[PDB]
Structure 1
Amino acid sequence: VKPNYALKFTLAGHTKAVSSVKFSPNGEWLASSSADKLIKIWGAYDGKFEKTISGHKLGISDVAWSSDSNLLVSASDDKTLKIWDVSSGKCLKTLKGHSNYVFCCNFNPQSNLIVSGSFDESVRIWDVKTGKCLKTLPAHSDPVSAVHFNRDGSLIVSSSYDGLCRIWDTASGQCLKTLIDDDNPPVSFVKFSPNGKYILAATLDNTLKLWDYSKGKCLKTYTGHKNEKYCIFANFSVTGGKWIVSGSEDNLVYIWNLQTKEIVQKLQGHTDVVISTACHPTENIIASAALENDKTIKLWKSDC
């Protein structure tokens, strides 16, 4: 079994590199963030432009949706995070506290909290209602590349250029586990599996690794792609066949069989590094976005 992802739409509009694409939990929309300081909303099924959301003073590295699809959070080079009302496009809160670029962000499932990672090497936990910083974790010794809550929001996983993956207890702010491997190459991306039992981690040695973080064992390795410079988003594709999806520095979207580790498809079309990929919550749809020499978002559809 192999998917047959085929190009459906090319979404043009960003004037600089696209940095992150995410599907709304309700599947109706795709949100994109960019170095052009804008957040754009698109129709997930027709690729139709919906609206531009603005307010950040500098480029945005990440955007994330709340569980009800009503809010977005964005992480910017301006050292802040902003919480946006999607329907109005209005900035509800500006989260201030990071002392360097904000790189990654996510809401917890309950969506009362936001987790952020910054070049300031810290991980911050924010209260959505007040915009107050609840906890500052001295998480890593280098820029924090990714932060993600697990399925029940009890845990946060963070990754850094320091070569470590750390699992944190959300309520206590304490570090539960540190994952180290080989010679500690920079960790460019991390996220929990949908069941929260595993973590998918990308390293700048052209490798993706599936970890059983509690047992501290690497179960699978995904290679063949190019990843030595950028913090490229990777995903678990679960709507059809069980795949691992990632962008690559060779301008391709890579799709591996989760179990066998074999490359099942390479999606050609982008003209620059595919920095971000996202998997649709209900349909076999992939959104992919590329850097400065491309600046577009592509929507791909598969039968499986």
Structure 2
Amino acid sequence: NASATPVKPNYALKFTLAGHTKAVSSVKFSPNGEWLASSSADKLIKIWGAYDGKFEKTISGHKLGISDVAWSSDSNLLVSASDDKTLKIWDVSSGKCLKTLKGHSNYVFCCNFNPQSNLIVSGSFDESVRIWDVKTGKCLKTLPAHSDPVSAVHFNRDGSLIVSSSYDGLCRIWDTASGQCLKTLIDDNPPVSFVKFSPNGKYILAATLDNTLKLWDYSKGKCLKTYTGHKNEKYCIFANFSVTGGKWIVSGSEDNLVYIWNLQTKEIVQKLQGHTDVVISTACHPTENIIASAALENDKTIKLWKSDC
């Protein structure tokens, strides 16, 4: 009683990046592919070579831990989101703080530039989404987005839309220009710990704290794919579309592994072993089949992985 008679990636460890003194929170590749930025509970941002993993510099100034970091499209600026209730805009070359973005009334959890990089979007424990002017550092809009902390914020491919997620169990799609809510994605209502648009902007990938990732057609409000087998019941774990080779979904996990799924078949195709604590963050290199992963305080390292597809 059995059946009658696709390629997988082969990610392998290349480098372990040590230096953070507390849990890592977020890793992001620069758009130019040259750098990896890491944020940590240790209040620091570190910059590493994306290709050889070589430590470049520490950027300091936040008064408390950092949950997230994000690059401008020209790779020249970073924004960071901190428990000190601020975001900071950094000149990466000089390491200098250009602007402190003040307005959130509690921890800032998540941040992103728009592709244009004239705006920053932030989400906070204060349950709001804010849109900031990069040039002036002024808050342009406060969206009453959620009824629990905002876990993720992301612009789509042309900057016209924002997606937000919250532990309130909702994903919302916002019109950037007006700040008006275009769509709420909702029955079981598990907390939403992470969301991002697909690179093509047609789909959103949402992580829920029932050990599940789902690919939504948000226009149709229909779930097209489900990815599971990993552990996620507590943390905001960054997930990704890997598009440089085979079409994969990449995520961290509370079982200390990096999970890679076939986007179409939803099968687990790789589990990357090596981290010694929760893998809180994954990132995919913009041009090469390279993954960065980072872990919580029993580990505190970033790992770089390479695949042939």
Question: Whole-Å Cα distance in 2 between the matches of residues 162 and 300 of structure 1?
Answer: 34
Instruction: Check if 1:280 corresponds to 2:262.
Output: no
Q: What's the offset of the Cα at 1:220?
A: 0.1
Query: Deviation per CA, 1:124-164, whole angstroms, max 9, x where unpaired?
Result: 00000000000000000000000000001000000000000
Q: What's the offset of the Cα at 1:8?
A: 0.2
Q: Which of these residues, 37, 54, 76, is aligned with residue 60 of structure 2? A: 54
Question: Whole-Å Cα distance in 1 between the matches of residues 153 and 51 of structure 2?
Answer: 28
Question: Whole-Å Cα distance in 1 between the matches of residues 71 and 147 of structure 2?
Answer: 28
Query: Deviation per CA, 1:51-84, whole angstroms, max 9, x where unpaired?
Result: 0000000000000000000000000000000000
Q: Which runs of 5+ in 1 are unaligned?
A: none
Query: Deviation per CA, 1:4-38, whole angstroms, max 9, x where unpaired?
Result: 00000000000000000000000000000000000
Deviates more, 1:182-191 or 1:284-293: 182-191
Residue equivalent to 1:210: 215
Over the matched positions of the two proteins, sequence identity in percent amounts to 100
Question: Whole-Å Cα distance in 2 between the matches of residues 184 and 98 of structure 1?
Answer: 26
Question: Whole-Å Cα distance in 2 between the matches of residues 185 and 222 of structure 1?
Answer: 15
Residue equivalent to 2:249: 244
Question: Whole-Å Cα distance in 2 between the matches of residues 183 and 100 of structure 1?
Answer: 28
Question: Whole-Å Cα distance in 1 between the matches of residues 189 and 142 of structure 2?
Answer: 24
Instruction: Check if 1:86 corresponds to 2:88.
Output: no
Query: Deviation per CA, 1:227-271, whole angstroms, max 9, x where unpaired?
Result: 000000000000000000000000000000000000000000000
Instruction: Check if 1:36 corresponds to 2:26.
Output: no
**4+ residue segments displaced more than 6 Å:** none
SS at match of 2:224: strand
SS at match of 1:276: strand
Question: Whole-Å Cα distance in 2 between the matches of residues 183 and 136 of structure 1?
Answer: 28
Q: Over the residues paired in the alignment, what is the CA RMSD in angstroms?
A: 0.3
Residue equivalent to 2:234: 229
Pairs aligned (count)? 303
Question: Whole-Å Cα distance in 2 between the matches of residues 299 and 178 of structure 1?
Answer: 36
Q: What's the offset of the Cα at 1:106?
A: 0.1
SS at match of 2:151: strand
Q: What's the offset of the Cα at 1:282?
A: 0.3
Question: Whole-Å Cα distance in 1 between the matches of residues 51 and 175 of structure 2?
Answer: 37
Q: What's the offset of the Cα at 1:122?
A: 0.1
Residue equivalent to 1:201: 206
Question: Whole-Å Cα distance in 1 between the matches of residues 188 and 246 of structure 2?
Answer: 33
Q: What's the offset of the Cα at 1:183?
A: 1.5
Residue equivalent to 2:297: 292
Residue equivalent to 1:118: 124
Q: How does the TM-score come out when normalised to structure 2?
A: 0.98
